[PDB]
């Protein structure tokens, strides 16, 4: 059976340490069912895209590779194609990545959206108000019905 | 569900400290359901514009950026377009911003309106008479019926 | 090599006919180096955003999709971030789209700006005074120097 | 709801101290429902003009600005246009403003009217006979019926 | 480069026909460098306010909207703030707007000023004596020096 | 530059026809530099008061409005305040206004002064002896020196 994951942090190969650091930091804030790209999904990326509610794009020095650019574009176009939830993709800015060192391409693709930064002192309220339980349960119901339709298609064949 | 907020203080990135300072100062004066731009809205700006009764434009040194100018113009044109309440936009003048240092563009856009300043000693009466409960409840009813119409439109699709 | 384009009309998939109709109408008015979103750019959107001087947002019935909303927000935030030229984004209103049928979200995002409409009889003067050659050449120089800096960054790697 | 105010003292920005000093001095003399320009009206000037019975023009050093001249002209022309009450505008002369230092323009606009001065020792009788209760109640009735007509016009729309 | 315009007629959306009718009527009388709000300025309002010498407020049936009220207040407060020229704002009364149908708010804001009406037969002398060339050249010099100061400020940054 | 005017005929809105009729009648009698209130002054009243030598108060049916009463009082008090020339204010009585229909208030304010009437056959001598050239030149010199003092005050600021 497939499990829904609350949030997913896409990251490069050499980023897993801060990936799970941020994931645990989030778990401490009261958001359950965490996930990181290289932990529960890589046993491609679309498999994580369709099974996650709110996508987290962790901007960092090693995220400037255009593979990350392809992931960002795929995630955004899938989110626009999918029904509802206009603001699932939540960019992130850890301590190790300065605001001024953001990669040109990735940051340009994220210029017109809110940015989550631990440099700010309002992180508690940011996570509290971005992850509202009601919309999260609505997303869970939407994913559950979409997976029901997927199972119907599978049974059709 | 969406929550109505009594007043909103739009501000730049490096202004949140005095933003919440002024918000708490207002809460102490007897105005409930406060709000600041970077606290309950950024998880774009129109989302805060349509869900707020009285807009607060905090003039300051770092509000001279033309992004603030765009916010001011959008707020004013939306207020003129919307029905009723000709005087929702209430400019503000904290201590850290002198009267003579007001930005040319933003202040010019606010030349022909009342200005709230803590330099004045009549601040108590200013807040008391600008935020009259009867007009505030009228604004709340107007917003509630507008959101009812919005829900009707959503259900139409 | 990359070519600068005078103006760009963003539009949905089923809009290309009136897109190029309006583009040719503009070419007839004396504005050179035209462009439409689905003609010279789609071989993502940021590629067209940074390589265009004045963005044209053609409001229409099939532009109400929130993908258009994302395009509008990205364009506006990029324009505010970029230096100079506060009024590049020029909304448009063709004949097939009535003034009263404007989409709620897209039109709300464009409430506080000038609107170009062929319903009006002052279209000649509107295009003449919005596309002033001097500011257009200033925009061309700004884009040329920005691309020179981009080439410098590319050569740095 | 709107409240009628017995008298209003128009004054500049740097005059509020003596404005409320004179207002309290008047309250001590037996005239109720006082008002000053920067206290109950600024949350434009016509809003105070139509909601006041007897206008007080406090001549002083900082009232020579031509904005005060515009206020004086607007008040006088509105009073002449309005029906009844030929002598609502009562000039004032506090202690801090000498009779010989009156501004040329403002004083010229007030040359042919009675002048209230605390330098005189007949101030008690001056206030007693200028603010006769019967004409004040007549003014209150006139304002009440005018506001009833205004409400009728509002309900017409 | 910015061009100074002799006079500007602010008007609503559905007024442009009589706007340019009156503008051409004025050009025929010997006043050069005409302008109307929806012709050379809309490609916000302050841009037209600071680049015009004598503001024309065309009272009409469709000018009663409170957006016109905001324009009137902004223009008057800017004129009072600016140095010199106490009487730039010249109200107008075309044929299609009767003297008795003047909007309550707009007309109230213009009660204490001269009114230009084509109903009167002294229109030639009215325009001749209101637009005296000497004061017009003084206004042009004032605007030129103000724009020189603005350019100095721009170069300072 | 400001021009001195020999005489001024104050009148209501619906009086301009007989106003200029009487003005031309006077010009025919040999008095130069004529003027009427609604012709060279309205582009407030004090502007005409200080720039005129001999004030003409044309009594008529439509001059009974108390605005005319305010004008009369202001003119008389200014004349008494000003130095010299005790008899500048010359009442007038045209044909269309009978001697017995004079308004109560205005006529009462003019009871103790000479009255100019075209009903009388001694009009030629009346105008000849009231407008003596020597006193007129004395008035012109007084006005010129007063305007020189006004210019000195203006230059002081």
From Swiss-Prot, chains A, B, C, D, E, F:
Tell me how the protein is altered or processed after translation. Phosphorylated by TBK1. The phosphorylated pLxIS motif constitutes an IRF3-binding motif, leading to recruitment of the transcription factor IRF3 to induce type-I interferons and other cytokines. Polyubiquitinated with 'Lys-6'- and 'Lys-33'-linked chains in a TRIM8-dependent manner; ubiquitination disrupts the interaction with TBK1 and subsequent interferon production.
Domain TIR, chain residue ranges per copy = 3-156
Tissues expressed in: Ubiquitously expressed but with higher levels in liver.
Site, (Microbial infection) Cleavage: residue positions: 157
Q: Where does this one sit in the cell? A: Cytoplasmic vesicle, Autophagosome; Cytoplasm, Cytosol; Mitochondrion
Superkingdom, natural source: Eukaryota
UniProt domain comment: The pLxIS motif constitutes an IRF3-binding motif: following phosphorylation by TBK1, the phosphorylated pLxIS motif of TICAM1 recruits IRF3. IRF3 is then phosphorylated and activated by TBK1 to induce type-I interferons and other cytokines.
Q: Which disease is it linked to?
A: Encephalopathy, acute, infection-induced, 6, herpes-specific: A rare complication of human herpesvirus 1 (HHV-1) infection, occurring in only a small minority of HHV-1 infected individuals. It is characterized by hemorrhagic necrosis of parts of the temporal and frontal lobes. Onset is over several days and involves fever, headache, seizures, stupor, and often coma, frequently with a fatal outcome.
Please give the subunit comment from the record: Homodimer. Found in a multi-helicase-TICAM1 complex at least composed of DHX36, DDX1, DDX21 and TICAM1; this complex exists in resting cells with or without poly(I:C) RNA ligand stimulation. Interacts (via TIR domain) with DDX21 (via C-terminus). Interacts (via TIR domain) with DHX36 (via C-terminus). Interacts with AZI2 and IRF7. Interacts with TICAM2 in TLR4 recruitment. Interaction with PIAS4 inhibits the TICAM1-induced NF-kappa-B, IRF and IFNB1 activation. Interacts with IKBKB and IKBKE. Interaction with SARM1 blocks TICAM1-dependent transcription factor activation. Interacts with TRAF3. (Microbial infection) Interacts with hepatitis C virus (HCV) NS3/4A protease; this interaction leads to TICAM1 cleavage, thereby disrupting TLR3 signaling and preventing the establishment of an antiviral state.
What does the UniProt function comment say about this protein? Involved in innate immunity against invading pathogens. Adapter used by TLR3, TLR4 (through TICAM2) and TLR5 to mediate NF-kappa-B and interferon-regulatory factor (IRF) activation, and to induce apoptosis. Ligand binding to these receptors results in TRIF recruitment through its TIR domain. Distinct protein-interaction motifs allow recruitment of the effector proteins TBK1, TRAF6 and RIPK1, which in turn, lead to the activation of transcription factors IRF3 and IRF7, NF-kappa-B and FADD respectively.
Can you say what this protein is called? Answer: TIR domain-containing adapter molecule 1
Specify first residue, last residue and whole-protein length for the fragment. Answer: 391 to 554 of 712
């Amino acid at each position: 059976e497939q499990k829904f994951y609350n949030f997913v942090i896409l990251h490069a190969r050499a980023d897993e340490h801060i990936a799970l650091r941020v994931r645990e930091k989030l778990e401490a804030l009261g958001v359950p069912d965490g996930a990181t790209f290289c932990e529960d999904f890589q046993v491609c990326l679309q498999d994580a895209i369709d099974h996650s509610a709110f996508i987290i794009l962790l901007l960092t020095s090693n995220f400037d590779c255009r593979l990350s650019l392809h992931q960002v574009n795929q995630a955004m176009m899938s989110n626009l194609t999918r029904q509802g939830s206009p603001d699932c993709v939540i960019p992130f800015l850890p301590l190790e990545s300065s605001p001024a060192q953001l990669s040109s391409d990735t940051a340009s693709l994220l210029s017109g959206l809110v940015r989550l930064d631990e440099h700010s002192q309002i992180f508690a309220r940011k996570v509290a108000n971005t992850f509202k339980p009601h919309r999260l349960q609505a997303r869970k119901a939407m994913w559950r019905k979409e997976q029901d339709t997927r199972a119907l298609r599978e049974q059709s064949q």
